[PDB]
Amino acid sequence: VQELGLSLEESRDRLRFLQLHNWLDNRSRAVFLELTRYSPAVGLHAAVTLRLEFPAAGRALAALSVRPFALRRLSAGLSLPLLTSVCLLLFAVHFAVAEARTWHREGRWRVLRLGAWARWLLVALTAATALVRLAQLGAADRQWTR
Amino acid sequence: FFIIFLAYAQLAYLVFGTQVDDFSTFQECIFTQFRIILGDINFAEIEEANRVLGPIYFTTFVFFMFFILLNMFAAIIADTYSEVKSDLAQQ
Amino acid sequence: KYLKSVLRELVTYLLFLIVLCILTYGMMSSNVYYYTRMMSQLFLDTPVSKTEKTNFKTLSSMEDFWKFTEGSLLDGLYWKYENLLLGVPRIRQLRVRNGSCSIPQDLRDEIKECYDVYSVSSEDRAPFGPRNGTAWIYTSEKDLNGSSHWGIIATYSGAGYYLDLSRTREETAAQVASLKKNVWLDRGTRATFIDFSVYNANINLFCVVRLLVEFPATGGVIPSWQFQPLKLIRYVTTFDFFLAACEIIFCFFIFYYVVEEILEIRIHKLHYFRSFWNCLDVVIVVLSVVAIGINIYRTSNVEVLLQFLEDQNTFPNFEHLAYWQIQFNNIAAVTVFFVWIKLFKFINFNRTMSQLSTTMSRCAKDLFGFAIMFFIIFLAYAQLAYLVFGTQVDDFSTFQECIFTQFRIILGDINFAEIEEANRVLGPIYFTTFVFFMFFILLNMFAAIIADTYSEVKSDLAQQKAEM
Amino acid sequence: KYLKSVLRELVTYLLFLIVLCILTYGMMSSNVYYYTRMMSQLFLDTPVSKTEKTNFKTLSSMEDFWKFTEGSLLDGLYWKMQNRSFIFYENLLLGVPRIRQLRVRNGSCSIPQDLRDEIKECYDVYSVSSEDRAPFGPRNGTAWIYTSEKDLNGSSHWGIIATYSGAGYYLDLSRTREETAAQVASLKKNVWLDRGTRATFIDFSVYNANINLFCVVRLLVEFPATGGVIPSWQFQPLKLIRYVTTFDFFLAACEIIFCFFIFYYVVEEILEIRIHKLHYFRSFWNCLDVVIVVLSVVAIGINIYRTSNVEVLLQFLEDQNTFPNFEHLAYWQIQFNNIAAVTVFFVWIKLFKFINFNRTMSQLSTTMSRCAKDLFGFAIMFFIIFLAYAQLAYLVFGTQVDDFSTFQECIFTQFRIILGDINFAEIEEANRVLGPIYFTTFVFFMFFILLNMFAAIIADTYSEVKSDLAQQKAEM
Amino acid sequence: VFGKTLCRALPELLGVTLGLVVLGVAYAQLAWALRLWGALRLGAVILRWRYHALRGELYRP
Amino acid sequence: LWPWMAHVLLPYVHGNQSSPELGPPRLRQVRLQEALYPDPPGPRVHTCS
Numbered sequence A: 001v002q003e004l005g006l007s008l009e010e011s012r013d014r015l016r017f018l019q020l021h022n023w024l025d026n027r028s029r030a031v032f033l034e035l036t037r038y039s040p041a042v043g044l045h046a047a048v049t050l051r052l053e054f055p056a057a058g059r060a061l062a063a064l065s066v067r068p069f070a071l072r073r074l075s076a077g078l079s080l081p082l083l084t085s086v087c088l089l090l091f092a093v094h095f096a097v098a099e100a101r102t103w104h105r106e107g108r109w110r111v112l113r114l115g116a117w118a119r120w121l122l123v124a125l126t127a128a129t130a131l132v133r134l135a136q137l138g139a140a141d142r143q144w145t146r
Numbered sequence B: 001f002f003i004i005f006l007a008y009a010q011l012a013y014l015v016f017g018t019q020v021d022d023f024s025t026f027q028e029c030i031f032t033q034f035r036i037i038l039g040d041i042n043f044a045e046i047e048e049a050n051r052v053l054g055p056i057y058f059t060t061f062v063f064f065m066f067f068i069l070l071n072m073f074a075a076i077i078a079d080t081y082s083e084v085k086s087d088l089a090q091q
Numbered sequence C: 001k002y003l004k005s006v007l008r009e010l011v012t013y014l015l016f017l018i019v020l021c022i023l024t025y026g027m028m029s030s031n032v033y034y035y036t037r038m039m040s041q042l043f044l045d046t047p048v049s050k051t052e053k054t055n056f057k058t059l060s061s062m063e064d065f066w067k068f069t070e071g072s073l074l075d076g077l078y079w080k081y082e083n084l085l086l087g088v089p090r091i092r093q094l095r096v097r098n099g100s101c102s103i104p105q106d107l108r109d110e111i112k113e114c115y116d117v118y119s120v121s122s123e124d125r126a127p128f129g130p131r132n133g134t135a136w137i138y139t140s141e142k143d144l145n146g147s148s149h150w151g152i153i154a155t156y157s158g159a160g161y162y163l164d165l166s167r168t169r170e171e172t173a174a175q176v177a178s179l180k181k182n183v184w185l186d187r188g189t190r191a192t193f194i195d196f197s198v199y200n201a202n203i204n205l206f207c208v209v210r211l212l213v214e215f216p217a218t219g220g221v222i223p224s225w226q227f228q229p230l231k232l233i234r235y236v237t238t239f240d241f242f243l244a245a246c247e248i249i250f251c252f253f254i255f256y257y258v259v260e261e262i263l264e265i266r267i268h269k270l271h272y273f274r275s276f277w278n279c280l281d282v283v284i285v286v287l288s289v290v291a292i293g294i295n296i297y298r299t300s301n302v303e304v305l306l307q308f309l310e311d312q313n314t315f316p317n318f319e320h321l322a323y324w325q326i327q328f329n330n331i332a333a334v335t336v337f338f339v340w341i342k343l344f345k346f347i348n349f350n351r352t353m354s355q356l357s358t359t360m361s362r363c364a365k366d367l368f369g370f371a372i373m374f375f376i377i378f379l380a381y382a383q384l385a386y387l388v389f390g391t392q393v394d395d396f397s398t399f400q401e402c403i404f405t406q407f408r409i410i411l412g413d414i415n416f417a418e419i420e421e422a423n424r425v426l427g428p429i430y431f432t433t434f435v436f437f438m439f440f441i442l443l444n445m446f447a448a449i450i451a452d453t454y455s456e457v458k459s460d461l462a463q464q465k466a467e468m
Numbered sequence D: 001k002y003l004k005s006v007l008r009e010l011v012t013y014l015l016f017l018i019v020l021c022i023l024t025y026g027m028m029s030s031n032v033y034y035y036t037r038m039m040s041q042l043f044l045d046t047p048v049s050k051t052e053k054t055n056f057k058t059l060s061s062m063e064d065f066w067k068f069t070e071g072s073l074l075d076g077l078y079w080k081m082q083n084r085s086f087i088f089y090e091n092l093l094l095g096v097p098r099i100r101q102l103r104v105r106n107g108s109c110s111i112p113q114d115l116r117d118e119i120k121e122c123y124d125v126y127s128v129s130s131e132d133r134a135p136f137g138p139r140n141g142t143a144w145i146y147t148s149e150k151d152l153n154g155s156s157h158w159g160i161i162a163t164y165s166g167a168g169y170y171l172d173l174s175r176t177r178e179e180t181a182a183q184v185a186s187l188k189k190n191v192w193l194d195r196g197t198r199a200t201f202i203d204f205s206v207y208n209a210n211i212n213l214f215c216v217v218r219l220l221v222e223f224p225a226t227g228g229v230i231p232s233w234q235f236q237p238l239k240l241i242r243y244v245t246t247f248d249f250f251l252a253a254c255e256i257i258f259c260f261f262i263f264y265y266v267v268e269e270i271l272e273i274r275i276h277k278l279h280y281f282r283s284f285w286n287c288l289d290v291v292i293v294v295l296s297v298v299a300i301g302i303n304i305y306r307t308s309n310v311e312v313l314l315q316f317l318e319d320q321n322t323f324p325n326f327e328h329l330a331y332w333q334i335q336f337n338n339i340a341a342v343t344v345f346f347v348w349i350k351l352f353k354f355i356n357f358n359r360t361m362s363q364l365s366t367t368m369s370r371c372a373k374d375l376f377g378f379a380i381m382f383f384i385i386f387l388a389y390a391q392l393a394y395l396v397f398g399t400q401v402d403d404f405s406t407f408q409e410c411i412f413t414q415f416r417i418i419l420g421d422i423n424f425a426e427i428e429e430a431n432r433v434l435g436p437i438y439f440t441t442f443v444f445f446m447f448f449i450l451l452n453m454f455a456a457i458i459a460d461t462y463s464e465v466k467s468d469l470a471q472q473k474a475e476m
Numbered sequence E: 001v002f003g004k005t006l007c008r009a010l011p012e013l014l015g016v017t018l019g020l021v022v023l024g025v026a027y028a029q030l031a032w033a034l035r036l037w038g039a040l041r042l043g044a045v046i047l048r049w050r051y052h053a054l055r056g057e058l059y060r061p
Numbered sequence F: 001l002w003p004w005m006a007h008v009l010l011p012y013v014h015g016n017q018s019s020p021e022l023g024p025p026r027l028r029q030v031r032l033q034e035a036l037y038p039d040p041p042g043p044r045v046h047t048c049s
Ligand SMILES: *[C@@H]1O[C@H](CO)[C@@H](O)[C@H](O)[C@H]1NC(C)=O
Pocket: C098, C099, C112, C113
């Protein structure tokens, strides 16, 4: 890693220092420049990443990605993304017990029909939708406090 | 037809409507699909916004709305015409 | 007694077809196009000067035009591509007069004069500037031996203020500079023509060149060019005589066809105009007679084409000789198409081909009936597009352009980047409703009609065969 | 009903056939085959020298190989650098080659006692017990001392000639074309493949650094005991770097889906044969499913085991100072090719198992041959109209468009218009009348009246096929 | 009728597309079918036959 | 890369009050330990190897 410094002048100092000392002329697969961006007028953050890959020494190919998101955190109370993520988790349980109550009633050999497969996909989708937002909310707290 | 059309339109708006500009607004999403029907737009940049849902969306859209749902509009009409002719010829 | 008639008709038609095909391909050489393209590159593609980036086809003002006529035009006209000039070029202008316009009384003090759009009833006929010679005095159309042009903005007459240039570069440049010193292109000028002709002895092929610059009444410059290569190949090598004999054979064939047609129309005094194989037989002979009389003109008035390699000082008037060469291809190309169509008269005897033709014929009344319901909506949409997008799109600037744009949209060649921004509302509505009403509803109706007709014709034919 | 017994088994069989077809299509190596063909052309068809007429496929004397190694084989393979290995600067060979000679031992046969005054000895064919092990001529090092089969990474193969094992003299090439030529000349001057020899072989590798395809090329020559020798070559495209990009991800997903479908089919078919009628073999429907499942499982296991380790290529690329033991990898690749042929046969068997609705195989040819007649009749009308329009366009727009310039180009222009590549900028500009008319009439008569006749023909054909089937099959 | 005509005709549609894709694989094995099928307009006739059958069945009650 | 960062990146990250930042950048690098041998110039060599 290279922290690049804080001020413009010291940034130039570090840049020229690692420029002359052959920091990037070797094998040196990638470069991976990526910093950040904030916008308080709309309240959005942005993850910016600039990358060069060297297939063979001599030339590079470039690629950049700018992902804008909103940093909403789990420790902020009972915001909407949590309310409609514990309610969706209840619809993934009422839809599961309603399948056990038919698995038991019909007994064995319910497999090989659409009704016993097209409803298990719904559970495996609702559970994922509920459990991904929670992970995102937790990661928000962890990264923000760090 | 138009319920599934809007179902594709809103999904495209939510997924690609941040990094394409061809799906930036809902109206643009609708007009893009209408242009897909004509075979006008090229998907050179769709996968850049997302790769899991990039080509999958295009392929499923084309298959389901250009070979199974866009025909029923033809078949029906054809069938109707036939019976109408009979409904005169017998008379 | 019946097969003999079919065989004689078939062999006569094959002989006529081979004569027509061999005759119309002896008048097409690979040089007639390359020479035109090279001449277009010589004038229309070189920069106006050796410093600017604007060529003739991208002019934007009168000053650029003055740069061109004292520039690339002279370089290409008097070369260091390997052609020579015959006669002498001529430059003419058409202008309107001050006071052909009606300023509103409210702001009369701010505008002292306005010039109207070009029109014969509002043309200038008075001398201006130094009343020295022929470049500053109005000359009538008769005294100029001219004719209309039908340019892009309007149809300009043959009169105007003209000037004949010199045979070589020095006096031509001096004379055009003398014109530029005075104001020969005032605000009243509405059109400018430049005419000349070249021979290019290296490969025997003439060329007549006419360039036009139109200044609309709203400022700006619109250029338009026209090159037309001519030929004087009569009885040259040992390949010609063949075409000369073929022309006589074709004329005899047309005489035979017209006498047969008059015999048939005398026997069948009427009802001869419904089989649709007789209308296509009189159209062909009429077009061939027209194309036979038009070929005589261009063949009779070609003796002067020579009286100009003598290096004289006069402007040749080759406009008519180059105008009829275009109206002769537009006739010799429709006759070939209508002759190649006629093969269906003889290949409709095979059972599958007869069934196909019967299918295509029994549905020729429902197809035409629906072609009116289709084209009423196709014009109701076009007029709406013309009214909404008719000033800022360059594709709907005229009604015909609207129709052709809709036809291209049917094929799927829509821009939609200009439609959506020209009118952010009522434009997308037009596009979406047009696509829905055409691709989903009105295009399947043709297929339904054709499919139903084909199915019923096949069933009828199978039933009839089963009866026997 | 017909929703759980007639709508699922057929659909599942069709899906399995589709998956098998996809897996078979994702197994055709085009670039590897092209590289192997180019290498064979530059090697098998390579003569001895400019003046000599001894090629790889024309082995007729013991000096044919010696003269071939110095010559065209040194031009198509041992090309100088810019000493690298690139003939056309694009065929990058991998590593260095190696040479082996399985010769007959000194005194590999016996001479008759009645003619012992004139007959010395003879040599037998190549075999495990007929391979030389002691020195043969001047053996300064390994140039004439045979290496053990187990100690030289060799084993019996039993190819087209004999079972040449790993025994025999071994030698390694150099890292320079000049050095390789000098070594070949030294080996040809001395007794390397003498009259008491039985087989020869050489093994090299090709990388083609511009293309991710590292394959092996092995040439062989069978020196029969009745004089002469027969040469040949074989290319093994063995690679284990498949996981590259989105195409590799799609292939892996398809393989996983096929494995899951096979497991589900086995689960669904392993219960109705155990707790139900067993020993059903001559039923043409119960043994076939079991055989297909077993064959699919065996093929999947063999394919997985073939790519158990991928460290050979990485080790060769990290250290390329010698010739790796690529014979085992080539044998594994040959076994994989045989398994691929067996998988094609299994796909044919699956197609046969998708023929449970039989008797519809040859009773419909009379209708297809009539549909073909109708299409042929239609193609005449379509082409007559097309050439009429092309001639019109070529005569009218001939000299002023650069698109309708030559007749052979007007056809392509009209085809592109049909596919939707219209320009319409010059067409209207070159002629404001008969320019729009041509385009409009062409579109109207090519998309509304003549393209809708092609569909109606097929519609009628399908309707009559349905009618005659639903008549005869459902009447008697 | 719209749901039924879509569900019953589904196997034939999948059979046709499978045939087209295997034909394309065979064609490419020697070393675009979208335009071909889109010009054959098959799916339309397959749907039309089932639609006519279902309408006839539903007409009587 | 060096003129690129010295021309646009620095004037964008640092300024008067030009586009608030919220955290300094970073330049993490991967070496690959297997120093590469190049190809003669011209067209780009396929994609990557
Ligand atoms: C044009 O005519 C009007 C009419 O009187 C006159 O006032 C004006 O001066 C004229 N302009 C020129 C340039 O002759």
